[PDB]
Coordinates of C-alpha atoms in Angstrom, one line a residue:
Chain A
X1151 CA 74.8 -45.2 51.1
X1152 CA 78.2 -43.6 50.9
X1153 CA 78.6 -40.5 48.4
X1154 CA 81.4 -40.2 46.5
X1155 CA 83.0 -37.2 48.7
X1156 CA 82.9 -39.6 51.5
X1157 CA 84.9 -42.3 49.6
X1158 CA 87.6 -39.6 48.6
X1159 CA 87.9 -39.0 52.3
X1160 CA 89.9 -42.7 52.5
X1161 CA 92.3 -44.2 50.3
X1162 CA 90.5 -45.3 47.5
X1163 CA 93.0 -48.4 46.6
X1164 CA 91.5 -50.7 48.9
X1165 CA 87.6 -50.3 49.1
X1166 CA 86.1 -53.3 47.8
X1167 CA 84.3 -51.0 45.2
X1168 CA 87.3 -49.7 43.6
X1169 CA 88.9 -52.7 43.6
X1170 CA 86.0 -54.7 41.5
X1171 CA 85.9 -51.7 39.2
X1172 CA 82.4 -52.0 38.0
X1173 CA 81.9 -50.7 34.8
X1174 CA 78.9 -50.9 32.8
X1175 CA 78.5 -51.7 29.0
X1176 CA 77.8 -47.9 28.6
X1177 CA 80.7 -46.9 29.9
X1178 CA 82.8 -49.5 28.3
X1179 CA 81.5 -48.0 25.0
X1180 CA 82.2 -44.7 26.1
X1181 CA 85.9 -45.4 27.6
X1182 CA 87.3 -46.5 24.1
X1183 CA 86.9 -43.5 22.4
X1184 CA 88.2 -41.6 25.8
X1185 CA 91.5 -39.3 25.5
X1186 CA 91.6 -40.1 29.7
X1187 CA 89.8 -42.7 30.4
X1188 CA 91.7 -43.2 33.8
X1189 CA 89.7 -39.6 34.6
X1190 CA 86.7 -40.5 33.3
X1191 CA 86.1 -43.6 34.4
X1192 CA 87.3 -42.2 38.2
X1193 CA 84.7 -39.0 37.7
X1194 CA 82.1 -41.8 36.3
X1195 CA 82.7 -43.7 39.7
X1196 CA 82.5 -40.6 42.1
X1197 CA 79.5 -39.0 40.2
X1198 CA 77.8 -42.5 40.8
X1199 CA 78.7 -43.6 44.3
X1200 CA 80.4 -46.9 42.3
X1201 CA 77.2 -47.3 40.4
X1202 CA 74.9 -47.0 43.2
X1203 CA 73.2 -43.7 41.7
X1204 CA 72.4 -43.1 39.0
X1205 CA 74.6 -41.1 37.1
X1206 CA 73.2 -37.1 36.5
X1207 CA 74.5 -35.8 33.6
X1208 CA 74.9 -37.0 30.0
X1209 CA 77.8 -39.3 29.5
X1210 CA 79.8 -38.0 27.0
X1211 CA 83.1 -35.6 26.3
X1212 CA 81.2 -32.2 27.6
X1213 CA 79.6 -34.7 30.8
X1214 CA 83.2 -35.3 32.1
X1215 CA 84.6 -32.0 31.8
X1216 CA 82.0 -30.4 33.6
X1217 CA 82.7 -33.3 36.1
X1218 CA 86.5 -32.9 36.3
X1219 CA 86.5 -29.2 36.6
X1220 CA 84.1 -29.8 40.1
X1221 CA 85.6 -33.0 41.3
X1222 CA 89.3 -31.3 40.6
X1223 CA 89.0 -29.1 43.3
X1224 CA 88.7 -32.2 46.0
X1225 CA 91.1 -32.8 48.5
X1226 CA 92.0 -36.0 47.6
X1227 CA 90.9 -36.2 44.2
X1228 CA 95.0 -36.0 43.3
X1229 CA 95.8 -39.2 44.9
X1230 CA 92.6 -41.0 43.4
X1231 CA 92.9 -40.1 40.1
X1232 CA 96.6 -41.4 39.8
X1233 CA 94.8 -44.4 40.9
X1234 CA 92.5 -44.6 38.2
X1235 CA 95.1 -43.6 35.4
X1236 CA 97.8 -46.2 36.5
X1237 CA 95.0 -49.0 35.7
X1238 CA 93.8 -47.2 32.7
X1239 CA 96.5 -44.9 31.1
X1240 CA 99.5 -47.0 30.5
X1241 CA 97.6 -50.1 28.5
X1242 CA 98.5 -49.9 24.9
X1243 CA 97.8 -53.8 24.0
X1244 CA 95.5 -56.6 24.8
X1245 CA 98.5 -59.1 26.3
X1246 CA 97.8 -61.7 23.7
X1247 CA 98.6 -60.8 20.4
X1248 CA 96.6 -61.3 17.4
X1249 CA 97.8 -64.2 14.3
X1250 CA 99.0 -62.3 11.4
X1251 CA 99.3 -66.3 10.1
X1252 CA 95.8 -68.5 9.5
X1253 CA 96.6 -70.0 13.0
X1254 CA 94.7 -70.2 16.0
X1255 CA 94.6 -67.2 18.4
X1256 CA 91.5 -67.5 20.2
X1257 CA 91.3 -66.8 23.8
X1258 CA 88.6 -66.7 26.8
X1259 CA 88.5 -65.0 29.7
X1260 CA 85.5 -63.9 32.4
X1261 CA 85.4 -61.3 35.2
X1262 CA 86.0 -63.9 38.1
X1263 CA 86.6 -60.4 41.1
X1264 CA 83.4 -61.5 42.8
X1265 CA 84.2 -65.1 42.9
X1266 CA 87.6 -65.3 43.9
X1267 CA 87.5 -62.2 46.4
X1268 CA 84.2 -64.4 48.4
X1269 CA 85.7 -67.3 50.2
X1270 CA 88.8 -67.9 47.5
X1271 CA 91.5 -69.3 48.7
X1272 CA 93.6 -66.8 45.9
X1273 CA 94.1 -64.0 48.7
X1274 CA 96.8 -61.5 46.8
X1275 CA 96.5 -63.6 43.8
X1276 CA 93.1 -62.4 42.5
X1277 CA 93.3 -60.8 38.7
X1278 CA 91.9 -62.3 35.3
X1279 CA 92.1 -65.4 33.9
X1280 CA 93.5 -65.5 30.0
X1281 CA 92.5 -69.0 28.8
X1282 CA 94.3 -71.0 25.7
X1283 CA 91.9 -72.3 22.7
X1284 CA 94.3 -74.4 22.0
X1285 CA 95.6 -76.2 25.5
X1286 CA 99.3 -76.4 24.6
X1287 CA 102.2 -74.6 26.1
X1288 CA 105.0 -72.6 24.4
X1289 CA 102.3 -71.1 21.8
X1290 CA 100.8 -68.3 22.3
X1291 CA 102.8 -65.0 23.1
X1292 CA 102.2 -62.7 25.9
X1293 CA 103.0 -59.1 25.3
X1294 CA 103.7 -56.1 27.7
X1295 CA 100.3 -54.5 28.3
X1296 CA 102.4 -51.2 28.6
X1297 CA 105.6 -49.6 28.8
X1298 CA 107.3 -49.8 31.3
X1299 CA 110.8 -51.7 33.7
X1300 CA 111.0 -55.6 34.5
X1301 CA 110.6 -55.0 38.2
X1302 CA 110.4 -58.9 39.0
X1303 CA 111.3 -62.4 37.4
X1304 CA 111.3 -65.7 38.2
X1305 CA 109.4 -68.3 40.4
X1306 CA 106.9 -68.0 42.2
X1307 CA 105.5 -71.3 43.6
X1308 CA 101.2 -69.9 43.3
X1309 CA 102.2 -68.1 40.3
X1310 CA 105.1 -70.4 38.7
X1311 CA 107.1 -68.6 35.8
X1312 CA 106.3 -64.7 36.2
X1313 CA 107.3 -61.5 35.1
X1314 CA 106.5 -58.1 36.9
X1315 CA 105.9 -54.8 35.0
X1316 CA 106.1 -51.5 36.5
X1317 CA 104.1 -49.0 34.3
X1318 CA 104.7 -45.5 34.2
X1319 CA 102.0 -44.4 35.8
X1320 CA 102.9 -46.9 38.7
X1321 CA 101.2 -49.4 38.5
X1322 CA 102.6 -53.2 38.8
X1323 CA 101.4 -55.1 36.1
X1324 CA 102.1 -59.2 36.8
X1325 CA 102.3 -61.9 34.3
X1326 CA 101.4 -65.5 35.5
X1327 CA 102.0 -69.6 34.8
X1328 CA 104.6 -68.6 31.6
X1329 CA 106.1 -71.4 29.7
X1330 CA 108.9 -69.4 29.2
X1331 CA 110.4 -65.9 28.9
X1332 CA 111.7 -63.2 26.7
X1333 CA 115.6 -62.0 26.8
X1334 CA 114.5 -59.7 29.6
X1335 CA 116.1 -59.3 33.0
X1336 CA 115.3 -57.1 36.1
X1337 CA 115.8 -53.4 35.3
X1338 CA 115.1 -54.0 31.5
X1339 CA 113.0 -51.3 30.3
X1340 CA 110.0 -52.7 27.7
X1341 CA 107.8 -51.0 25.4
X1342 CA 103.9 -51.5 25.5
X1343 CA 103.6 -55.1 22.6
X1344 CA 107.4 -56.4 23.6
X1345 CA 107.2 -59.7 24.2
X1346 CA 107.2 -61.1 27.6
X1347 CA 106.8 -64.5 27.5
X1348 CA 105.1 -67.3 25.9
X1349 CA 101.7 -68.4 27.8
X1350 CA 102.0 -71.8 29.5
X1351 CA 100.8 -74.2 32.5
X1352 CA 103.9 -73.5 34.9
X1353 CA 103.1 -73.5 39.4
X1354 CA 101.9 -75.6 41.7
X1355 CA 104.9 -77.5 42.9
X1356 CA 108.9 -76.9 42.6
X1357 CA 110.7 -74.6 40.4
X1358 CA 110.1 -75.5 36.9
X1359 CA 107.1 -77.7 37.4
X1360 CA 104.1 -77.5 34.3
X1361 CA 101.2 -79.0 32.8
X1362 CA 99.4 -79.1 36.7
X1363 CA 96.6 -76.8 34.8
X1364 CA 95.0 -75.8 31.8
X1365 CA 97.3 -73.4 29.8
X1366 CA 96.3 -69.8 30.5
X1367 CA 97.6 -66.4 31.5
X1368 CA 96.7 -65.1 34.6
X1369 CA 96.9 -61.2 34.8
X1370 CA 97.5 -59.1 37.9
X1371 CA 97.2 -55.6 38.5
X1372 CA 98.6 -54.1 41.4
X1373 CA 99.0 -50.7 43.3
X1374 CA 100.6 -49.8 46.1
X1375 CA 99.1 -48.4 49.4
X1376 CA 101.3 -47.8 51.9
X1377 CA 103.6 -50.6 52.4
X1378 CA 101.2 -53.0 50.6
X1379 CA 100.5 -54.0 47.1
X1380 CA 96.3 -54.7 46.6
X1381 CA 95.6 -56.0 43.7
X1382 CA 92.7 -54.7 41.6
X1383 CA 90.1 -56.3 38.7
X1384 CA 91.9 -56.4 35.8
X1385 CA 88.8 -57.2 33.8
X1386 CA 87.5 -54.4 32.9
X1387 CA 90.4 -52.8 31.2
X1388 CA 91.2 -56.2 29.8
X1389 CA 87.5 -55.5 27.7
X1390 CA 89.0 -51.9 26.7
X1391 CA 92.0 -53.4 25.5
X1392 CA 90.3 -56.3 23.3
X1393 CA 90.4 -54.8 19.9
X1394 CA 93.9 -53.7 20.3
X1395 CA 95.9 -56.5 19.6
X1396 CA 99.2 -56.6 18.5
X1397 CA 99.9 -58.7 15.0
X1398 CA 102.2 -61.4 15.5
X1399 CA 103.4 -64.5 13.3
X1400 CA 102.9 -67.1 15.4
X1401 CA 104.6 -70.2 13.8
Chain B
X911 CA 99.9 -95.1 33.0
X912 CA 96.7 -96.5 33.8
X913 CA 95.0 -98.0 30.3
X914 CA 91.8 -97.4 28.6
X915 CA 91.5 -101.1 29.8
X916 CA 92.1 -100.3 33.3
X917 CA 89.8 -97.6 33.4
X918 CA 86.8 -99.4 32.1
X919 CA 87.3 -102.0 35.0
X920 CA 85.8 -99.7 37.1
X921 CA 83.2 -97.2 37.4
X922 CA 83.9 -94.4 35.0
X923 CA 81.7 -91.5 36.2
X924 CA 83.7 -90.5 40.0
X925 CA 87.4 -90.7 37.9
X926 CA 88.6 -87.5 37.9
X927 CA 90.0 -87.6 34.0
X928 CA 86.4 -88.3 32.8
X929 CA 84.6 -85.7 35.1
X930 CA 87.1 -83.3 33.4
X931 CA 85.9 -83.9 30.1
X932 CA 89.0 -83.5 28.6
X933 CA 88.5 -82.7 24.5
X934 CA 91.2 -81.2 22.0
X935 CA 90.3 -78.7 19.1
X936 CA 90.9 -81.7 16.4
X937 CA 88.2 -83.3 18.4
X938 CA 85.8 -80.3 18.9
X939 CA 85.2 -79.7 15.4
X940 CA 85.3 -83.7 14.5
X941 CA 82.3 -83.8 17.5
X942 CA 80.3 -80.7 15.7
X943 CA 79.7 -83.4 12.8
X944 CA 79.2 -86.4 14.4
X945 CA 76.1 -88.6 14.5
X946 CA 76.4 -89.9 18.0
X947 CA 79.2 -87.9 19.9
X948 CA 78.6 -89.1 23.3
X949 CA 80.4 -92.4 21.6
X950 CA 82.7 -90.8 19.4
X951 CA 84.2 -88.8 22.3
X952 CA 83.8 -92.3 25.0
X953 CA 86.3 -93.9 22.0
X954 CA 88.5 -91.2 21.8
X955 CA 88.7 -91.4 25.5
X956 CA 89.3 -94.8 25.3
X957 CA 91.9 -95.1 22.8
X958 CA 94.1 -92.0 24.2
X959 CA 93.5 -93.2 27.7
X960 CA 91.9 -89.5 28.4
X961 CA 94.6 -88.1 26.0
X962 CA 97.3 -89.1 28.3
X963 CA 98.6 -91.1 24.4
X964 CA 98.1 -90.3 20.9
X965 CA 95.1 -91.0 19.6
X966 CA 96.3 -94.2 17.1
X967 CA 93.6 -93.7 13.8
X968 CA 92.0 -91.5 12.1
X969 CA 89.7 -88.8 13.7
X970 CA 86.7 -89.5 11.0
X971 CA 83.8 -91.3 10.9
X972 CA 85.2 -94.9 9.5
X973 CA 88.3 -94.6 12.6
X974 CA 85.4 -94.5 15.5
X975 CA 83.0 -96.9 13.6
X976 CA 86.8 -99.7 13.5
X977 CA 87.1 -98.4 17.1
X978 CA 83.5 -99.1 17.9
X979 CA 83.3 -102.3 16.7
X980 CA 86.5 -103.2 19.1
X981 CA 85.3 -101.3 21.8
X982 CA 81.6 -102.5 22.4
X983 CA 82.9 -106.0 23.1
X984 CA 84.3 -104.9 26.8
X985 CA 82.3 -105.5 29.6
X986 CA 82.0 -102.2 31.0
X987 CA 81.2 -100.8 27.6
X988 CA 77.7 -100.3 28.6
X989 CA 77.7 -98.5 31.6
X990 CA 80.6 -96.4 29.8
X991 CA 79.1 -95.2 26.5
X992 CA 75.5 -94.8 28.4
X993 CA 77.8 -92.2 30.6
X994 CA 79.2 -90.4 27.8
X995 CA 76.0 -90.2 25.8
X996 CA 74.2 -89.4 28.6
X997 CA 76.3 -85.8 28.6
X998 CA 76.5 -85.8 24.7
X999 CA 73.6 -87.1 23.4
X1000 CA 70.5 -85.3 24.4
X1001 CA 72.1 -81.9 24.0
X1002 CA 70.2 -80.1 21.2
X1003 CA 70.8 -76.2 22.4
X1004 CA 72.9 -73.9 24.2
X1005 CA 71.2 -72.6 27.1
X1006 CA 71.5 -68.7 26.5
X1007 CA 68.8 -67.8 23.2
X1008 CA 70.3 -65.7 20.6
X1009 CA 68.4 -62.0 20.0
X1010 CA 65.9 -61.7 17.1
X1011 CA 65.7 -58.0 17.5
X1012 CA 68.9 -56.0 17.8
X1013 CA 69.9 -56.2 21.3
X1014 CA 72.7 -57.5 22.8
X1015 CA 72.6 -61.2 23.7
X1016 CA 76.6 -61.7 24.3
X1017 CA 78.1 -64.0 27.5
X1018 CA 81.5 -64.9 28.0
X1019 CA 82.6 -68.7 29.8
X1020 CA 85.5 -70.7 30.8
X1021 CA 86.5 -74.4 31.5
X1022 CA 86.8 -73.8 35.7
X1023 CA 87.1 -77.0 36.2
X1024 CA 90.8 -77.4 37.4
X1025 CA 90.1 -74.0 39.3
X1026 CA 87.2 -75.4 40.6
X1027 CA 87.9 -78.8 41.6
X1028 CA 91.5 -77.9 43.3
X1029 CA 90.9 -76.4 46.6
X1030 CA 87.8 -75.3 45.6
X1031 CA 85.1 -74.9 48.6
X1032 CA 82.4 -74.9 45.5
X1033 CA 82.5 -79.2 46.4
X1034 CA 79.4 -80.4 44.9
X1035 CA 78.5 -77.0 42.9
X1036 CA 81.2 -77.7 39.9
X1037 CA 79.8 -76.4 36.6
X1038 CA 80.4 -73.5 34.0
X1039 CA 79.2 -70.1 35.3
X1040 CA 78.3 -68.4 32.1
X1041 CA 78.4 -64.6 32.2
X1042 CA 76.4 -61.7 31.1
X1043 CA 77.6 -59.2 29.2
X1044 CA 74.7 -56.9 29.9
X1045 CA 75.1 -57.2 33.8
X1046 CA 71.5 -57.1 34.8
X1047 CA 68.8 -59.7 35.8
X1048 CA 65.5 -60.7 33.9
X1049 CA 67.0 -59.9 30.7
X1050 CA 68.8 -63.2 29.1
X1051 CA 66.1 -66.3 29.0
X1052 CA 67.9 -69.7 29.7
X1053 CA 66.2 -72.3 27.8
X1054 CA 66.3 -75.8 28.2
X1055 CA 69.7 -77.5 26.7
X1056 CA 67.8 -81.0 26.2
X1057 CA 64.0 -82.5 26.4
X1058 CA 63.4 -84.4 29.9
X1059 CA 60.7 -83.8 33.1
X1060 CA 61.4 -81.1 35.8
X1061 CA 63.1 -83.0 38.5
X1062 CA 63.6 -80.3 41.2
X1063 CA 62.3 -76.4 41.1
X1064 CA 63.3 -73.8 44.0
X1065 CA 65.8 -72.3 46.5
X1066 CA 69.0 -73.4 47.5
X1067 CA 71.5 -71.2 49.4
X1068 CA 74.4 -71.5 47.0
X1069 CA 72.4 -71.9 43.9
X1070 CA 69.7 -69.3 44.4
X1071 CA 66.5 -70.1 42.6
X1072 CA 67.6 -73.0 40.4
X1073 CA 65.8 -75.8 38.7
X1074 CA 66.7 -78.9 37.5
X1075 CA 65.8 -81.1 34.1
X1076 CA 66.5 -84.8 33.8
X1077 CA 67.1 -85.4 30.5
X1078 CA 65.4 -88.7 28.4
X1079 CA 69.4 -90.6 28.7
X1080 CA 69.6 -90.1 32.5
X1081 CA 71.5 -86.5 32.9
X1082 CA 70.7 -84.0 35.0
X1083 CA 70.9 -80.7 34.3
X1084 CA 71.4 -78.2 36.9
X1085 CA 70.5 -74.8 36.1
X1086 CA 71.0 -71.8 39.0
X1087 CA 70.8 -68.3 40.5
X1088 CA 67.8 -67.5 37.8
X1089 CA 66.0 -64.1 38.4
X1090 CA 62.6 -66.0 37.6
X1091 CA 61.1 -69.2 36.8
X1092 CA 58.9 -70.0 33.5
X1093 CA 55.3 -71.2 34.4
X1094 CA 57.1 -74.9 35.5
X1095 CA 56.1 -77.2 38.1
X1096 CA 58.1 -80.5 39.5
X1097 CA 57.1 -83.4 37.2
X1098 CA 56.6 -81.3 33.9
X1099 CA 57.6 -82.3 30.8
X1100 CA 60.2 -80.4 28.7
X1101 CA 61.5 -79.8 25.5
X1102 CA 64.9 -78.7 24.4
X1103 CA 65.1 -75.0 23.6
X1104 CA 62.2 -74.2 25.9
X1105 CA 62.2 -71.5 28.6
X1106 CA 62.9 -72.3 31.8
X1107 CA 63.8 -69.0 33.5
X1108 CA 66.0 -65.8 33.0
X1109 CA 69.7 -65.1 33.8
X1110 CA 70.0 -63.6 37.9
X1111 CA 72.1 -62.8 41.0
X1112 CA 69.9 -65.3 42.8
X1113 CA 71.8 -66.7 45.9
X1114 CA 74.1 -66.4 48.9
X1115 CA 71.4 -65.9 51.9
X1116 CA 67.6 -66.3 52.5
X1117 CA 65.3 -67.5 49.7
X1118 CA 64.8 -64.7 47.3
X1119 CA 67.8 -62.8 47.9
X1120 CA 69.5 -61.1 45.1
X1121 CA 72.4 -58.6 44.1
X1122 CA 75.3 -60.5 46.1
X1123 CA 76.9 -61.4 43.1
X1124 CA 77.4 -60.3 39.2
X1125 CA 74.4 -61.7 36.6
X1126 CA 75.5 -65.4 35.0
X1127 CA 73.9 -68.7 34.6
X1128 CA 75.6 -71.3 37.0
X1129 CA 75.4 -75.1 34.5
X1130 CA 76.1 -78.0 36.3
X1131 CA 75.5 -81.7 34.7
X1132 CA 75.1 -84.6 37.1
X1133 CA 75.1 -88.4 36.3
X1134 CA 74.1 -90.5 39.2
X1135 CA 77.0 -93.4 40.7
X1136 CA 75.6 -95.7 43.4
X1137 CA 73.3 -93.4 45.2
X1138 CA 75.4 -90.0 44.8
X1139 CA 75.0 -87.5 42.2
X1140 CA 78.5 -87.1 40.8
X1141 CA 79.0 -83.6 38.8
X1142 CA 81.1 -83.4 35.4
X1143 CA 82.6 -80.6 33.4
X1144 CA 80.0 -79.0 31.3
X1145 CA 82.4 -76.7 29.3
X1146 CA 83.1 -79.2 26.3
X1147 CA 79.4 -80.3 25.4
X1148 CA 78.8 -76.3 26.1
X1149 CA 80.9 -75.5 23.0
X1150 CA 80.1 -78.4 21.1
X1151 CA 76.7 -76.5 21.5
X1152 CA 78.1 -72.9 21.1
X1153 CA 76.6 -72.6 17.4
X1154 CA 72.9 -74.0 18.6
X1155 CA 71.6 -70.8 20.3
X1156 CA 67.6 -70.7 19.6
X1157 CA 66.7 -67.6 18.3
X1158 CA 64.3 -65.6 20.3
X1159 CA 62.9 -61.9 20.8
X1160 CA 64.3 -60.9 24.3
X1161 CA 62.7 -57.4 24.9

């Protein structure tokens, strides 16, 4: 195996195990009732080897503070915590707001890490996958996860209509395949349930092209190390964030 | 445009709209109520040209029985409707039981299809990979969606340990990386709702190896054109099923 001191001996940001951030249904209980849950879930991973131990103590408030006052003293343990709280601190919202209306706001979404990381051709574009219900452009809004400053906008041609959101904490958060944007340009500050965007079918071909896909959002979340920007699963704190959507009027 | 005509001049089960399966809301909840949906949804492929136009009637019973009776006086009909009812038609459950007792018997799916099917190295493999919520193997029985005979039982590298029903209108369903088999042999006859196997991480090496990849069912529904075995879209007759979950004590 490899213990947890030895992973805090390397960057954390790009070991395969931080990046798939596995998080059991335990822990996903747990973490929505957490005042830190970017610590916790970061003690939870180094007190488990990335869930390949079991984990010793009792998982609960007094559990992670007897953790974080150990694991504190680390070198290293700086660094990876900021890790874990730009994924985990910043998010607010759920990026799809709920109906306040009796309209349709039902969305889908699986942890796809494992299949796009193993031969997918999606290298640097790997995050979660937001489907529509309803399969039509221009509907459903897409909200800022977080606060935080438009950092990029426009075309991409993998990604068509996008929107980049540096969070606080550091973290990039990415918006994908928009139908349209918000009256936001580069250096904009947001607030965590602003609107972005509205989700649509945009990419694969020239500027402006649509309706190549099924409608969806695809969600990125990226953090830098070194020079590069790795992108990690999104998925997990996509679950955390599911019962906290904003209300919207749709229509 | 190429014409619901057009379309039926030729073999319908290789062309890419029909694989797709393409099916709006209006039509999900129309198919939910429908007597025989495998022709209600050929019709409504017929007379949108696989909604590429509006859809010229009424959605209801007495629109698809004026459509019908237009319809069944192609030549091609027959092969055509046989297609779609062979998908529709013998469906009676969702594969994934619901829990008797109070456990947890949530999973989460998509329509991968596009994903799948555009520079997707998955070429044969195209399904709906439906995914545990509890992420562990031997817990979620899949049951049988349909009756038919056990066509094929055991390993594949990139299905794990998978076995596979033919179904009494001439579907087969594909079901893979299962933890365990029930007490099935090749040649054994089926009903719908009965267990073949539970939910695993079954695949990706030599027979019997697990763990490679996160706990899901992998679906796949093949019709047979010529002498290949052509794979469709099994997302829209999965949630036309979504509601038929046999109840069953898990633990």
């Amino acid at each position: 195996g490899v213990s947890g001191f030895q992973r805090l001996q390397k960057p954390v940001v790009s070991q395969p195990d931080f990046r798939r951030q596995p998080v059991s249904e335990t822990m996903q209980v747990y973490l929505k009732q957490a005042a830190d849950p970017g610590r916790d879930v970061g003690l939870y991973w180094m007190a488990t080897d990335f869930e390949n131990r079991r984990f010793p103590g009792k998982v609960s408030p007094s559990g992670f503070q007897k953790l974080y006052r150990q694991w504190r003293n680390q070198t290293g343990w700086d660094a990876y915590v900021q890790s874990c709280r730009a994924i985990w601190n910043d998010v607010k919202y759920f990026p799809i707001p709920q109906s306040l209306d009796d309209t349709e706001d039902k969305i889908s979404y699986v942890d796809s890490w494992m299949f796009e990381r193993n031969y997918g051709g999606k290298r640097g574009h790997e995050g979660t996958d937001i489907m529509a219900e309803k399969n039509t452009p221009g509907y459903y809004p897409v909200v800022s996860m977080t606060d935080g400053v438009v950092t990029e906008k426009g075309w991409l041609e993998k990604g068509g209509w996008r929107i980049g959101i540096t969070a606080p904490t550091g973290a990039y958060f990415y918006y994908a395949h928009l139908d349209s944007y918000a009256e936001l340009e580069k250096g904009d500050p947001v607030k965590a349930g602003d609107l972005l965007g509205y989700m649509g079918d945009s990419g694969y071909g020239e500027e402006g092209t649509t309706g190549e896909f099924p409608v969806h959002l695809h969600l990125g979340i990226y953090l830098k190390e070194g020079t590069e920007e790795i992108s990690v699963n999104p998925y997990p704190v996509l679950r955390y964030a599911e019962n906290a959507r904003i209300k919207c009027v749709y229509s």
